[PDB]
Design a protein around this ligand. Structure first.
Ligand code: NI
Length: 341
């Protein structure tokens, strides 16, 4: 059965609620982004209205075969009317096509559902600036002060400089980047751009990228692995055995692999700066875990919430344990006392 924090009071709406069958009283299902914990349940057999971004709708149609007549894409930053209720989709700074959703309830209440997001000061100048928000359904993935990580721009500088140095020292080195979902495309696109290469990948992954409206994509990606010196592999294969096996398949073109695993947070964050990050090495294979996050750090989350000043916060992540829930509630009260709302 559908949990309460996926239901929007005073409407017929649910958010990211496709794995519970026919939800009682739901007239329109919203989908914030194309990540499997959120789309779980969707297919060609779905016959209710799904509301989403244009990019998410391309992925529903091509990857899951949802029929066109049930996909309702909405433009961003535009007031739209859905089953008699005004809504707005805003950029979530998560993966491609990911949105936050503002609902303007008929009784005067305003609700913001962040979906999954990486808070940023740029959000303080969207359509949020223009009215009060009463309730916030908040992505609390990293809601504890131990979660620090660098900006995306610092992480990409490290990756580009690392790859460019390695391949300039050894033109026979292959670079490999792990992936298992959409998101984090800058990692592999920035490395390919510095090296003067396209990114090579499976036909299934190429299909997924072609759904994303990324400009000049036919220029940056390919299925011809033999012409590429940056390869994308499933995340599961980014280990010494998987990589040794891949290097065999390349037929003596290469004699070294430099591989990247973009994780979210790892506890090497609490002791080490990005500049100081080192790989795991075995023989002619090196693996770098890089802290490229598409979720708010603690400080970024705190800043957003203290700017927005909601009357009530409903967490959507880490809600399954009493210890997690109690910890989160204590930070919310701190933020409110420090800021004065
Ligand atoms: Ni996500």
């Amino acid at each position: 059965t559908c949990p309460f924090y996926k239901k929007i009071p005073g409407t017929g709406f649910t958010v990211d609620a496709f794995q519970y069958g026919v939800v009682e009283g739901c007239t329109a299902y919203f989908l914030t982004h194309f990540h499997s914990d959120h789309y779980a349940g969707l297919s060609k057999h779905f016959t209710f209205p799904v509301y989403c971004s244009e990019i998410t709708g391309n992925l529903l149609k091509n990857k899951l075969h949802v029929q066109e007549q049930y996909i309702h894409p909405l433009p961003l930053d535009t007031e739209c009317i859905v089953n008699g209720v005004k809504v707005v989709l805003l950029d979530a700074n998560h993966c491609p096509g990911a949105v936050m959703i503002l609902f303007y309830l008929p009784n005067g209440t305003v609700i913001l559902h962040t979906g999954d997001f990486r808070a940023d000061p740029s959000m303080e100048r969207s359509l949020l600036a223009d009215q009060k928000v009463h309730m916030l359904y908040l992505d609390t993935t990293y809601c504890s002060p131990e979660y620090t990580f660098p900006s995306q721009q610092e992480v990409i500088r490290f990756a580009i400089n690392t790859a460019f140095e390695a391949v300039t020292l050894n033109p026979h080195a292959l670079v490999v980047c792990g992936t298992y979902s959409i998101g984090k495309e800058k990692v592999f696109l920035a490395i390919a751009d510095v090296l003067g290469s396209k990114v090579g990948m499976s036909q299934e992954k190429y299909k997924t990228l072609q759904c994303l409206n990324i400009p000049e994509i036919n220029s940056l990606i390919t299925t011809d692995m033999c012409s590429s010196l940056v390869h994308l592999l499933p995340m599961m294969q980014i280990n010494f055995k998987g990589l040794q096996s891949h290097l065999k398949k390349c037929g003596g073109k290469y004699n070294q692999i430099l591989a990247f695993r973009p994780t979210g947070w790892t506890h090497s964050n609490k002791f080490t700066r990005i500049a100081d990050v080192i790989p795991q090495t075995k023989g002619n294979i090196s693996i770098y875990g890089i802290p490229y996050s598409e979720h708010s750090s603690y400080l970024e989350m705190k800043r957003f919430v203290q700017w927005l000043k909601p009357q009530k916060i409903i967490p959507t992540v880490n809600v399954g344990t009493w210890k997690s829930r109690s910890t989160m509630e204590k930070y919310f009260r701190e933020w409110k006392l420090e800021a004065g709302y």
